[PDB]
């Protein structure tokens with residue numbers, strides 16, 4: 001039972017518009033380096049725009065990072081029967097309902113990972129560049 | 133059919149542990165009200181953790197909210213071949229790399245939707261409460 005399906009979406013099928021974008025992508029070189037390194041960890045959200053084409057609802061920075069890497073596809077969830085109003089609500093939902101993990105929590109986590117012997121070079125790098 | 137798959141996962145199939153949790157869930161009242169009204173919009177992330185059981189990697193607040201709705205299940209991505217280190221990385225990924233949308237952006241969106249005649253009462257109320265103190 002599905003209205004949502006996840007696919008490896010060719011970027012040529014994504015409409016070249018940005019109605020649901022909330023903010024400029026900005027510099028995505030750091031996000032792109034992380035995606036080249038680890039893969040794209042979280043799929044973006046799109047809806048059909050007829051014509052075997054799709055409109056981006058969430059994920060502008062991730063898509064911008066994949067274009068920086070000169071990739072031709074993005075992992076995407078396709079939402080069926082997503083109205084204009086419900087796509088607007090979706091585009092805002094992480095912004096409104098996510099609780100950020102503050103730097104105090106990240107520092108305490110780093111210290112605990114160290115006490116546990118779980119601080120790999122790559123995780124140390126990540127946490128310290130975020131805590132800089 | 134690759135290395136991740138999405139399921140409606142019974143909550144009783146999560147291990148009773150919190151190895152990858154970063155912070156207390158806190159009051160999930162408002163998140164639960166939103167999920168009751170709109171559905172769970174984004175799936176949580178898990179990995180297999182024994183026979184027919186799973187370990188939560190991302191999504192402790194959504195799981196708490198669903199348990200604060202007395203629901204039987206959570207929408208979940210099951211990650212295969214997710215090592216201990218790669219799960220730690222994934223549990224930190226949104227925290228480190230997600231750029232917040234600040235309230236200045238939310239107010240400017242509220243104002244633009246109004247100016248456009250596109251501001252429904254529902255979205256007005258959502259933006260105004262996010263912009264509440």
Ligand SMILES: Nc1ccn([C@@H]2O[C@H](COP(=O)(O)OP(=O)(O)OP(=O)(O)O)[C@@H](O)[C@H]2O)c(=O)n1
Pocket residue numbers: 021022023025031034035038039040041042043057058059060061062063225226227229230231232
């Ligand atoms: N290797 C990585 C590193 C990060 N992420 C994800 O990239 C997202 C970046 O979040 P955000 O700053 O909100 O960017 P987008 O959602 O892509 O862009 P927008 O919010 O503007 O639509 C985070 O969810 C993070 O988990 C990812 O998919 N793969």
Ligand SMILES: Nc1ccn([C@@H]2O[C@H](COP(=O)(O)OP(=O)(O)OP(=O)(O)O)[C@@H](O)[C@H]2O)c(=O)n1
Pocket residue numbers: 093094097098099100153154155163166167170171172173174175189190191192193194195
């Ligand atoms: N109706 C709603 C409203 C919110 N969300 C999601 O709930 C998540 C809340 O994020 P966060 O504060 O980080 O909580 P969790 O990820 O669930 O918990 P944790 O970060 O501690 O693992 C956001 O991604 C938001 O999009 C959702 O799925 N359905």
Ligand SMILES: [Mg+2]
Pocket residue numbers: 058059094
């Ligand atoms: Mg985002």
Ligand SMILES: [Mg+2]
Pocket residue numbers: 190191226
């Ligand atoms: Mg989270």
